[PDB]
Amino acid sequence: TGLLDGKRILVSGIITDSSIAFHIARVAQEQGAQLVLTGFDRLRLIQRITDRLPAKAPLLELDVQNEEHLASLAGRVTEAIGAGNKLDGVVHSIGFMPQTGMGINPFFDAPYADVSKGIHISAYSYASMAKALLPIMNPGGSIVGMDFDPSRAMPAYNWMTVAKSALESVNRFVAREAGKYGVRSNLVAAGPIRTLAMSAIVGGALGEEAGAQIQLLEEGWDQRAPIGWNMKDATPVAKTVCALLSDWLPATTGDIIYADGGAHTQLL
Amino acid sequence: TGLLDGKRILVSGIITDSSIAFHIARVAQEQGAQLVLTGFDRLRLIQRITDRLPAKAPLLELDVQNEEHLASLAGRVTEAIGAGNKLDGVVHSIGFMPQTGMGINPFFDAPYADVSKGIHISAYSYASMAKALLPIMNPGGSIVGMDFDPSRAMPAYNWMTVAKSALESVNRFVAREAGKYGVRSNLVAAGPIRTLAMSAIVGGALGEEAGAQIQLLEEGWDQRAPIGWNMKDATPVAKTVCALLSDWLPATTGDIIYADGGAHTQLL
Amino acid sequence: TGLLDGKRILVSGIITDSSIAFHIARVAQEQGAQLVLTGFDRLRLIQRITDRLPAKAPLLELDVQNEEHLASLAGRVTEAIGAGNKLDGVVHSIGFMPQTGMGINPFFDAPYADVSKGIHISAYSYASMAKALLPIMNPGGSIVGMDFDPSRAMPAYNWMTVAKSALESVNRFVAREAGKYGVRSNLVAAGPIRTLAMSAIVGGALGEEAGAQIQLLEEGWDQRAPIGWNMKDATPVAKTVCALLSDWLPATTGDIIYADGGAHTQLL
Amino acid sequence: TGLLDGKRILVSGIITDSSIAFHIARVAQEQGAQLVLTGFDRLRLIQRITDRLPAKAPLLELDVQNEEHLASLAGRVTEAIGAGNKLDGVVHSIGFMPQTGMGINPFFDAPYADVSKGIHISAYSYASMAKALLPIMNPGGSIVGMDFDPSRAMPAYNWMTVAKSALESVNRFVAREAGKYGVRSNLVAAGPIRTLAMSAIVGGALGEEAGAQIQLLEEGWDQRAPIGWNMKDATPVAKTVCALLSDWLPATTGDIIYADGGAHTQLL
Ligand SMILES: NC(=O)c1ccc[n+]([C@@H]2O[C@H](COP(=O)([O-])OP(=O)(O)OC[C@H]3O[C@@H](n4cnc5c(N)ncnc54)[C@H](O)[C@@H]3O)[C@@H](O)[C@H]2O)c1
Ligand SMILES: NC(=O)c1ccc[n+]([C@@H]2O[C@H](COP(=O)([O-])OP(=O)(O)OC[C@H]3O[C@@H](n4cnc5c(N)ncnc54)[C@H](O)[C@@H]3O)[C@@H](O)[C@H]2O)c1
Ligand SMILES: NC(=O)c1ccc[n+]([C@@H]2O[C@H](COP(=O)([O-])OP(=O)(O)OC[C@H]3O[C@@H](n4cnc5c(N)ncnc54)[C@H](O)[C@@H]3O)[C@@H](O)[C@H]2O)c1
Ligand SMILES: NC(=O)c1ccc[n+]([C@@H]2O[C@H](COP(=O)([O-])OP(=O)(O)OC[C@H]3O[C@@H](n4cnc5c(N)ncnc54)[C@H](O)[C@@H]3O)[C@@H](O)[C@H]2O)c1
Ligand SMILES: CCCCCCCCCCCCCCCC(=O)SCCNC(C)=O
Ligand SMILES: CCCCCCCCCCCCCCCC(=O)SCCNC(C)=O
């Protein structure tokens, strides 16, 4: 038993055991929830990884860009959980953006073909996923997607910041749409965690200039954060997503709950 | 056992069983926390009311405006809980403002002697209380005070809005101050609940004009709210304060967690 | 002479004499600025309309979605103004969204092909335009695009809100990009103005089901607005865009200046 | 010509040629605005200070913490300008707060007295000069006092950022109980210019701690602004205030006009 006792919670976005999505699943499982895991394309590969999760959770295939995947979604999920049973949650830990609009390549240069590829998988997909799953959700259910404070412009995040900013706005509209089924829609704003990707830029893969600009940024995050910030530990972020998936915040919708050590409230 | 199992949580602001503070205590108690209740002046009276709380919690006297009360605070509390034991939380459900700056009397007329009386008990007291108690708080502890979205100017709330706006800012500074002890500082923003006071204005005690301006406001709160808003039930607000008092949001500080049905994110 | 004396200011987005862009041009011209007008496709038609502008301003063709148009942009403009002379401003009054995005279309239905068509012309084009023109701008120059407060979710705007929200974020990044040339980037947030089919969004073609929606919106806007709101007059918005184009706000960048009667600051 | 050639304005708050006001005033006094100034506890001081200014304007011994003073804050200016000849501007730059809630003296090391005592000029104040000068004001005309971004918790500024979150909230209600007057009350928030308060809170009377902290935040703002920021001068910031008096920013209220240099909007 536990925080997520008896709840059937869906969790997408696991590609490795460093994924925030992997930690959300691990913690969600410990807390008692029953998971239905979805994976992009490396099905036999990420399968192996989902084997690390304390409990077995049926892996289903889901490319958010494909309406064939979306359509089948609710359907498979039902077979995944059972007939009669419905979903208590949906976790959208999906975020993409080709190097063209994120990082060392300039802001003005990133072409729309890529920007749009990020805005479709990062921002929009939240909607289409709320769209495909909402019907099979019990009232009182919760849908929570990841965010990264787009309020102020920062170097490198460039177009991925813009796609996240669009994400928050979408959150609000899905919120009233989810309202009709009793579901809540919320977004979590974490500080940088070191997934494969971040370890990459850190160690000069991007190079000197970049690896530093981001180093200091991660560095400063700890400066301002009152209870500090531990970028090599996602457990604080997993815990937060689980709380939002519980009966303890039954009134927050179209909202954003920050889990970045409060770094965003301090200036220095 | 439960959400607040084994935690010793302080809860001030109970004057009746309609007080949000009363609900925070009732739920906190059910969830397993051990309470230490503080009361303003009607000690023998509010005592009788705290008797309704599922469990007995030692009532201590606390007038936030009195430095004698503040100084003794930590002290008594220790006797209240025991030698060795420390506090896991502090709940500041205190808010005051003489009718001069709130309601039907105009904004320009409210004199500073009153405005200041509200700003001392509503805004500042959060600090002095964090001041008096912080020392006896275990790291990982949480301090949460009530708020009422001051972002946009609304009729009647007038100077009490201003004092709450000052409150949020104080929250941020106490946040970094609490950081050094491992405590988190957060503010909850609820929509209108009907305590004694609100039932009063509603039923024309203030009169026609006022009783209506507030009626429609409470009315519209439900309009915009996606999962609606039940002003005759504080259970949703109590639940939220308890979650903030738990291990499930270990990274939010100097923050504000809205519990108003998300009415604040929608325009219509 | 006047507010925009001697300044060569570009103004895009004029399709009729109801366009806010038309008013920005009329006032800009009165104030002394020299205009370089751009039109989408109805070149012979909107040409006829630009003839109403107090003074003649060379019409150039510009489809923002076409990199051929963009590339040629700086070039033509130079021939339009002269050799040696540079631009002092750029006004991006461009905004698009097919009825499946906005409309009364259930938000979940709007497919990405359209959403993306709006996000390319509304949000992104701001960038590519700042991209194409920045080079020929004098330091101290100003680029200002239109906005419509996306902070809170409102009915009908749906995906166009999302595109506008993306727009503000882009503004911030163009802001630091423009910084290097001395140019400022800012967005103006107006309340509803009535433009010919926008009179078919209320008491015309689009106000029968969720059509009164833009009534109580067009209505409520005046309620909350302290100095009121006159939706049948764009002069207040034109005046604001000209001030931003002047030497009187030399330090605001990546910012948003609201021109909706302050309706956005009041709750009721 | 001028923005203000012909506009009648009271500019409140001159102590030095180096403090904000002496700036707004020469700039305002040069733009055709005929002004009437206010001074504090050494008017014999602000007197010969003022000769340094561009033309003549009388000095009224005020102090918005004195009520016989507030009492007469209309029919003394009405005596100062014309025999029933009206007034256009209220450029409030009245603000102050004692060194215990300052930086040097720690957040918790201070009491109410002093905070309450500073708000009176800092926060509350704007909600004073308002009522007084109001029915002696002409439509159009504005009420505008300085703001220093309260949003993030600026350590070292402490209570005079909290008072700042409060000046703001109070300027929004004056945005309504003035909007009937067709008057504007709008806040111009700007960055830490080197004035006698700051120029001295470094060179000698505070030794360090708030100091390193302040220079800590000055290297910042500069390094963080797209169009950059200088602090050895206030002129672009003084200008941004002016057009906020003119007819060029016509549709805003209970608003914040930012001339900080785009520093409030840049993460890194
Ligand atoms: N790591 C950080 O610093 C950090 C911090 C806060 C928030 N975030 C955000 O959280 C999200 C997850 O990133 P992460 O680093 O925690 O984990 P991750 O990158 O390991 O997980 C992201 C997932 O995106 C998915 N994806 C991409 N395109 C897809 C598509 N077409 N269809 C279906 N799935 C697709 C992949 O399956 C992948 O598992 C992103 O939105 C990211 O911006 C990251
Ligand atoms: N009721 C609502 O509509 C509503 C909604 C959201 C937030 N709030 C806020 O929550 C807080 C509590 O109000 P409520 O209606 O839930 O309950 P309440 O009014 O019943 O409780 C408020 C408490 O203020 C305390 N108090 C006043 N001065 C004091 C002082 N000098 N020293 C010590 N204690 C003092 C009293 O002891 C009283 O118990 C206020 O800040 C209020 O603005 C109210
Ligand atoms: N009317 C209102 O209620 C209102 C209020 C505030 C802000 N706004 C915003 O201001 C902008 C202008 O709308 P409006 O009603 O004032 O005027 P409008 O609709 O008359 O002008 C908009 C322009 O969009 C242009 N456009 C579309 N696609 C283009 C493309 N592919 N390439 C180049 N140009 C293209 C057209 O040329 C057209 O002139 C929009 O962003 C709108 O959302 C509208
Ligand atoms: N310099 C900075 O750090 C900076 C920069 C931007 C914004 N802010 C804010 O800008 C505003 C302008 O400050 P300045 O830097 O020109 O300061 P200054 O102190 O040199 O001049 C402004 C005035 O503060 C006044 N003041 C104190 N009590 C007052 C009272 N009771 N009556 C009348 N005036 C009162 C004095 O009369 C003094 O003349 C302040 O409110 C400041 O908080 C500060
Ligand atoms: C190769 C990764 C690109 C480098 C990181 C992008 C620029 C970093 C600066 C902004 C910091 C923002 C924190 C966000 C980090 C991310 O979104 S990681 C990308 C998500 N998933 C992967 C592995 O691609
Ligand atoms: C007698 C109460 C005064 C009337 C209510 C104030 C004006 C209501 C309009 C704004 C609505 C805001 C909701 C907030 C309500 C409160 O803070 S109730 C006062 C707190 N405690 C008491 C009983 O005095």
Side-chain angles (χ1 to χ4, degrees), chain A residues 2-268, chain B residues 2-268, chain C residues 2-268, chain D residues 2-268:
Chain A
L3 206 280
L4 293 317
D5 177 276
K7 303 177 159 299
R8 301 187 188 234
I9 307 178
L10 188 161
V11 225
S12 62
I14 298 178
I15 188 63
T16 49
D17 53 27
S18 63
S19 302
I20 269 168
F22 187 90
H23 300 295
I24 299 168
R26 164 185 52 127
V27 193
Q29 255 164 5
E30 307 172 339
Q31 298 325 307
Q34 184 207 94
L35 310 183
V36 167
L37 307 168
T38 61
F40 191 26
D41 70 85
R42 290 208 284 223
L43 247 266
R44 188 180 74 154
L45 189 142
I46 52 205
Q47 218 300 321
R48 187 179 297 139
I49 295 159
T50 67
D51 281 269
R52 299 300 177 207
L53 301 169
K56 55 174 178 184
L59 213 313
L60 299 181
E61 186 171 355
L62 176 66
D63 161 22
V64 303
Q65 289 177 286
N66 184 237
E67 282 57 43
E68 308 189 71
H69 281 302
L70 264 31
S72 52
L73 226 203
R76 307 178 246 133
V77 172
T78 293
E79 160 274 309
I81 48 170
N85 312 318
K86 269 145 154 289
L87 277 189
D88 298 304
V90 172
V91 178
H92 179 266
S93 179
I94 293 151
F96 174 72
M97 181 63 76
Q99 296 264 39
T100 176
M102 179 162 141
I104 190 268
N105 189 64
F107 194 67
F108 278 161
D109 301 305
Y112 199 72
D114 303 83
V115 185
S116 194
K117 261 214 60 190
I119 291 174
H120 193 165
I121 297 175
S122 301
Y124 183 102
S125 67
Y126 192 51
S128 25
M129 198 163 163
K131 181 170 170 190
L133 299 157
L134 199 33
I136 57 183
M137 295 195 79
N138 282 110
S142 191
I143 302 167
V144 42
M146 300 306 126
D147 193 3
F148 188 90
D149 196 74
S151 340
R152 353 205 120 297
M154 61 208 115
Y157 218 53
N158 302 4
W159 293 100
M160 175 56 147
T161 319
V162 183
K164 225 53 168 156
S165 196
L167 201 228
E168 301 178 332
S169 184
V170 183
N171 182 20
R172 293 171 213 143
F173 290 81
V174 181
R176 65 236 308 285
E177 285 290 353
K180 310 170 185 192
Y181 301 65
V183 174
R184 308 187 295 281
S185 184
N186 272 314
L187 254 39
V188 168
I193 292 290
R194 280 193 181 162
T195 328
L196 188 289
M198 297 310 266
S199 310
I201 36 93
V202 169
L206 232 64
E208 303 268 301
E209 343 74 65
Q213 236 100 167
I214 289 159
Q215 217 72 222
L216 73 75
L217 171 150
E218 295 185 86
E219 195 180 276
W221 208 270
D222 189 79
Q223 245 85 89
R224 291 128 63 279
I227 40 169
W229 186 246
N230 190 13
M231 74 179 139
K232 30 269 185 286
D233 180 24
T235 300
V237 179
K239 278 173 172 290
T240 288
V241 167
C242 293
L244 212 30
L245 289 165
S246 61
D247 305 327
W248 303 101
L249 283 99
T252 175
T253 281
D255 235 340
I256 298 173
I257 281 61
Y258 306 80
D260 61 330
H264 83 96
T265 55
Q266 317 301 331
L267 195 60
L268 291 297
Chain B
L3 205 281
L4 293 316
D5 177 275
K7 303 177 158 297
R8 302 185 186 236
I9 307 176
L10 188 163
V11 226
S12 65
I14 297 176
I15 186 64
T16 48
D17 53 27
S18 65
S19 300
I20 269 166
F22 188 90
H23 301 295
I24 298 171
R26 164 189 52 130
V27 192
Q29 257 165 4
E30 304 172 341
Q31 297 326 306
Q34 184 207 93
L35 311 181
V36 167
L37 308 166
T38 62
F40 190 26
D41 71 85
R42 290 207 285 223
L43 247 266
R44 188 181 74 154
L45 189 140
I46 54 206
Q47 218 300 322
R48 187 178 298 139
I49 295 160
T50 66
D51 282 90
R52 298 299 177 207
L53 299 171
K56 53 175 179 184
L59 212 314
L60 298 183
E61 185 170 355
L62 176 67
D63 161 22
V64 302
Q65 288 178 286
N66 185 238
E67 282 56 45
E68 309 188 70
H69 282 300
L70 264 31
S72 52
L73 225 204
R76 307 180 245 133
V77 170
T78 291
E79 161 273 309
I81 49 170
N85 313 316
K86 268 144 156 291
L87 276 190
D88 297 308
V90 172
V91 177
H92 178 270
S93 178
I94 293 152
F96 174 73
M97 180 62 73
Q99 296 263 38
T100 178
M102 178 165 137
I104 188 268
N105 191 70
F107 194 66
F108 278 161
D109 303 302
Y112 199 70
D114 303 83
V115 186
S116 194
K117 261 215 60 190
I119 288 173
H120 193 165
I121 297 176
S122 302
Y124 182 103
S125 68
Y126 192 52
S128 27
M129 196 164 165
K131 182 169 171 191
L133 299 158
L134 200 34
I136 57 182
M137 294 195 78
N138 283 108
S142 193
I143 303 167
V144 44
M146 300 304 123
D147 192 8
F148 188 88
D149 196 74
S151 341
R152 353 205 119 296
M154 60 207 114
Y157 218 52
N158 303 3
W159 294 100
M160 176 57 148
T161 319
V162 184
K164 225 55 166 156
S165 196
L167 197 232
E168 304 177 325
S169 183
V170 183
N171 183 21
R172 292 172 214 144
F173 289 81
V174 180
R176 66 235 308 284
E177 285 292 354
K180 310 168 185 193
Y181 300 64
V183 175
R184 309 185 295 280
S185 188
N186 273 314
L187 255 37
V188 167
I193 292 290
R194 281 193 182 162
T195 331
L196 188 290
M198 295 309 267
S199 310
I201 36 92
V202 169
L206 232 65
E208 302 269 306
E209 339 76 62
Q213 235 99 172
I214 289 156
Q215 215 74 219
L216 70 79
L217 174 151
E218 297 185 82
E219 194 181 276
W221 208 271
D222 190 78
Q223 247 84 87
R224 292 129 61 279
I227 41 170
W229 185 245
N230 191 13
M231 75 177 137
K232 32 268 186 285
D233 178 26
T235 300
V237 179
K239 281 173 170 288
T240 289
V241 168
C242 297
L244 211 30
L245 287 166
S246 63
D247 305 325
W248 302 101
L249 285 98
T252 174
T253 281
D255 236 343
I256 299 172
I257 281 60
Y258 304 84
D260 61 332
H264 82 97
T265 54
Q266 316 303 328
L267 195 60
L268 292 297
Chain C
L3 206 279
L4 294 315
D5 178 271
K7 302 176 159 300
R8 304 187 186 237
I9 307 178
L10 189 161
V11 227
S12 61
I14 296 178
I15 187 66
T16 46
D17 52 26
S18 67
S19 304
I20 268 170
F22 188 89
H23 301 294
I24 297 169
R26 166 187 54 125
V27 195
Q29 253 163 8
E30 304 175 340
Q31 298 325 305
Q34 184 205 97
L35 312 183
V36 167
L37 308 166
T38 64
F40 189 25
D41 70 87
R42 290 208 284 223
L43 246 266
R44 188 180 74 156
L45 188 141
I46 53 205
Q47 217 299 323
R48 186 178 298 139
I49 296 158
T50 64
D51 282 89
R52 298 300 178 207
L53 299 170
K56 54 174 180 184
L59 213 310
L60 301 182
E61 185 170 354
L62 177 66
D63 163 16
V64 301
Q65 292 176 283
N66 185 241
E67 282 57 48
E68 307 191 74
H69 281 303
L70 265 32
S72 50
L73 225 204
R76 308 182 242 135
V77 167
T78 292
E79 159 274 311
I81 49 171
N85 313 317
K86 268 145 155 289
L87 279 187
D88 298 307
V90 171
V91 179
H92 180 270
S93 181
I94 292 147
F96 174 73
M97 182 64 70
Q99 298 263 39
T100 198
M102 258 160 71
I104 288 306
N105 215 105
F107 172 90
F108 276 167
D109 301 300
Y112 199 71
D114 304 80
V115 185
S116 196
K117 261 214 60 190
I119 290 175
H120 195 160
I121 297 175
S122 304
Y124 182 104
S125 66
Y126 191 52
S128 24
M129 196 168 169
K131 182 171 171 190
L133 300 158
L134 201 32
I136 58 181
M137 295 193 84
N138 283 109
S142 192
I143 305 169
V144 44
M146 301 306 122
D147 193 6
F148 187 90
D149 196 75
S151 343
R152 355 203 118 297
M154 61 205 116
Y157 227 67
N158 305 2
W159 294 99
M160 175 60 154
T161 317
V162 181
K164 226 57 167 147
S165 199
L167 193 241
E168 307 181 323
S169 185
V170 184
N171 181 23
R172 290 174 214 140
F173 289 86
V174 182
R176 64 238 308 288
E177 282 295 354
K180 310 167 186 189
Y181 299 62
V183 177
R184 306 186 299 277
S185 183
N186 273 315
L187 254 37
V188 170
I193 293 291
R194 280 194 180 161
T195 44
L196 304 178
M198 167 146 236
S199 318
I201 202 173
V202 247
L206 293 149
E208 215 261 10
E209 291 162 310
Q213 281 278 11
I214 321 84
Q215 261 189 89
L216 340 169
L217 226 145
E218 289 219 85
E219 197 181 274
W221 210 270
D222 189 77
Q223 249 82 89
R224 292 129 62 278
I227 41 175
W229 185 245
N230 188 13
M231 75 176 138
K232 31 266 188 290
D233 179 22
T235 302
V237 179
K239 283 173 168 289
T240 288
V241 169
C242 294
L244 214 29
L245 287 167
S246 62
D247 306 328
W248 301 103
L249 285 97
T252 174
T253 286
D255 238 340
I256 299 169
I257 280 59
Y258 305 85
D260 60 332
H264 84 96
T265 55
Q266 320 299 336
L267 195 61
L268 292 298
Chain D
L3 289 182
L4 299 3
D5 235 279
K7 276 261 281 178
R8 209 119 49 196
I9 310 172
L10 163 156
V11 187
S12 61
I14 306 188
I15 213 271
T16 46
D17 330 286
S18 52
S19 54
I20 268 82
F22 174 116
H23 302 283
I24 276 171
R26 61 176 183 136
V27 181
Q29 192 160 92
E30 293 172 309
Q31 292 287 322
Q34 199 252 278
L35 325 151
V36 281
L37 307 151
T38 82
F40 203 91
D41 241 314
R42 322 269 240 90
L43 295 137
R44 251 208 48 135
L45 169 76
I46 149 132
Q47 238 293 290
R48 179 281 287 160
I49 238 105
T50 63
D51 272 65
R52 306 292 147 226
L53 267 281
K56 183 60 171 53
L59 226 211
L60 315 193
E61 168 224 339
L62 182 51
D63 161 36
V64 290
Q65 190 166 342
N66 173 177
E67 282 38 295
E68 300 161 288
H69 268 357
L70 259 325
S72 333
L73 220 208
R76 242 221 284 181
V77 176
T78 303
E79 201 267 72
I81 43 177
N85 286 293
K86 316 205 73 172
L87 190 221
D88 290 314
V90 184
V91 263
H92 171 251
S93 276
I94 256 185
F96 161 82
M97 153 169 304
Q99 81 132 124
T100 68
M102 250 298 86
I104 169 272
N105 193 82
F107 190 45
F108 283 134
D109 273 33
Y112 208 57
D114 280 314
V115 175
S116 351
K117 167 186 175 34
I119 275 194
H120 230 113
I121 314 78
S122 303
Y124 185 77
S125 189
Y126 198 65
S128 83
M129 302 186 76
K131 66 189 315 173
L133 300 141
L134 262 57
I136 47 103
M137 265 193 122
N138 324 35
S142 73
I143 291 148
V144 37
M146 176 56 65
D147 161 32
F148 184 156
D149 198 311
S151 322
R152 308 293 144 120
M154 307 193 273
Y157 239 73
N158 311 309
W159 287 116
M160 175 73 128
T161 283
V162 174
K164 278 316 168 191
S165 180
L167 175 29
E168 295 194 342
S169 218
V170 162
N171 123 100
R172 285 218 194 76
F173 291 84
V174 193
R176 43 169 78 207
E177 234 167 75
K180 275 172 176 178
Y181 285 80
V183 178
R184 243 114 52 213
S185 69
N186 293 303
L187 239 76
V188 181
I193 309 120
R194 278 297 210 70
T195 28
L196 262 307
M198 313 292 91
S199 183
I201 295 285
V202 149
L206 225 90
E208 193 76 349
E209 277 178 271
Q213 211 167 152
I214 195 68
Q215 229 149 259
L216 199 312
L217 199 18
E218 303 203 62
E219 140 284 342
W221 213 273
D222 287 45
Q223 199 182 79
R224 216 157 76 276
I227 60 73
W229 180 261
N230 211 107
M231 72 270 191
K232 303 81 180 176
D233 124 276
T235 288
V237 171
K239 287 203 180 179
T240 306
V241 201
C242 315
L244 202 36
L245 295 184
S246 64
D247 346 82
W248 299 107
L249 278 142
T252 182
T253 233
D255 249 352
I256 315 189
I257 263 51
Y258 291 120
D260 54 333
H264 70 86
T265 19
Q266 300 326 320
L267 205 42
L268 300 288

